[PDB]
Amino acid sequence: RDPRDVPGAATGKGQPVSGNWLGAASQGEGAPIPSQIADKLRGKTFKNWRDFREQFWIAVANDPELSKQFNPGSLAVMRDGGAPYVRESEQAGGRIKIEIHHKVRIADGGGVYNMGNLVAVTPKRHIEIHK
Amino acid sequence: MKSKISEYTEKEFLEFVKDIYTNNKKKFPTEESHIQAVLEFKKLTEHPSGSDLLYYPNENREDSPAGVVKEVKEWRASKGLPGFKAG
Ligand SMILES: [Br-]
Ligand SMILES: [Br-]
Ligand SMILES: [Br-]
Ligand SMILES: [Br-]
Ligand SMILES: [Br-]
Ligand SMILES: [Br-]
Ligand SMILES: [Mg+2]
């Protein structure tokens, strides 16, 4: 399996975000985890990475502020645990959904479910970094 | 499955788009099945906005499955492409 696909508990702090959170996903380092989401998840345990991802997008879709930034189509996906689809301009082939990347590699000491180690990125932006 | 949008009636295509849009789990029980249907949608419509019709729709029209269908129908008509099978 991947290094992130491991049991753990969410910890750490997110960052305050704006009215267009995922606008940051396509540039620089990615979009930070919103402080409200880091809070909602704090202390929860996950059996594996797909469990975390599912709880993360459900939390987004239930948040009164962030859910305003997503249309009904997207929320229908997120309520079910799925990541939203990115804009066509941010798709990179077969990858068409927002991805969560670790800023510090787990092999280099990074926290798997530390919210300060996570960013949301589009596929196009991820590949700009790693190809 | 139907291969070309001209095999759908408009009502059939609306019901496929409503299924994708509402995330109907009876049709798409898995995330992987939904992704496939979105890729199928992009292929069928041939529309240059692709999945943005569903998720990032133009503010000039209704954000709904009917809005999506109408946009697709009117765009293909305006390019001289084949339309829906008659109902
Ligand atoms: Br995007
Ligand atoms: Br992910
Ligand atoms: Br860790
Ligand atoms: Br019809
Ligand atoms: Br509708
Ligand atoms: Br038609
Ligand atoms: Mg990464």
Instruction: Using an 8 Å CB-CB cutoff, list chain A residues near B49.
Output: 88
Residue A102: active-site member: yes
d(CA A62, CA A32): 18
Domains, chain B, ordered by start: 1-87 (1.10.1200.20)
Task: Indicate the SS3 state at residue B8.
Answer: coil
Asked if B5 contacts B13 with a C-beta cutoff of 8 angstroms, the reply is yes
Q: Tell me, yes or no, if A53 is annotated catalytic.
A: no
Distance CA A76, CA A55 (A): 14
Do A90 and A124 contact (CB within 8 A), yes or no?
yes
Buried b (16+ CB within 10 A) or exposed e, A108-129: eebbbbbbbbbbbbbbbbbeee
CA of A120 to the centre of ligand 1 (A): 10
How many Cβ atoms sit within 10 Å of the Cβ of residue B60? 7
Q: How was this structure determined?
A: X-ray
CB contact under 8 A, B63 and A84: no
Considering only CB atoms, A88 lies closest to which of B22, B31, B51, namely B51
Please give the structure tokens belonging to residue A19.
């009215």
Contact call for B63 and A85, based on CB within 8 A: no
Which residues are within 8 A (CB) of B20 and not within 5 positions of it... i.e. 6 or more apart? A73, B28, B34, B37, B38, B41, B54
Tokens representing A36 are: 């409200």
Q: Which ligand is closest in space to the CA of residue A70?
A: 1
- CA-nearest residue to A69 within chain B is B56
Q: Which of A42, A101, A105, A125 is catalytic?
A: A101
A47 is in an annotated binding site: no
Number of domains in chain A: 1
Domain with A86 in it: 1-131
Q: Which CATH number does the domain housing residue A57 bear?
A: 3.90.540.10
Alpha-carbon torsion (B47, B48, B52, B58), positive or negative: negative
Q: Is A126 annotated as a binding residue?
A: yes
For residue B61, how many other CB atoms are within 10 A of its CB?
14
DSSP result, A62-113:
H-TTGGGGS-HHHHHHHTTTPPPBPPGGG-BTTB-B-EEEESS-GGGT--SS
Question: Which token pair is A44?
Answer: 């929860």
Which 8-state DSSP code applies to residue A121?
Answer: E
- On whether the CB atoms of residues A84 and A97 are closer than 8 A, the answer is yes
Nearest Cα to Cα of residue A51 among A107, A8, A97, A111: A8
Q: Is A37 annotated as a binding residue?
A: no
Of all residues in chain A, the one with the smallest CA distance to B31 is A82
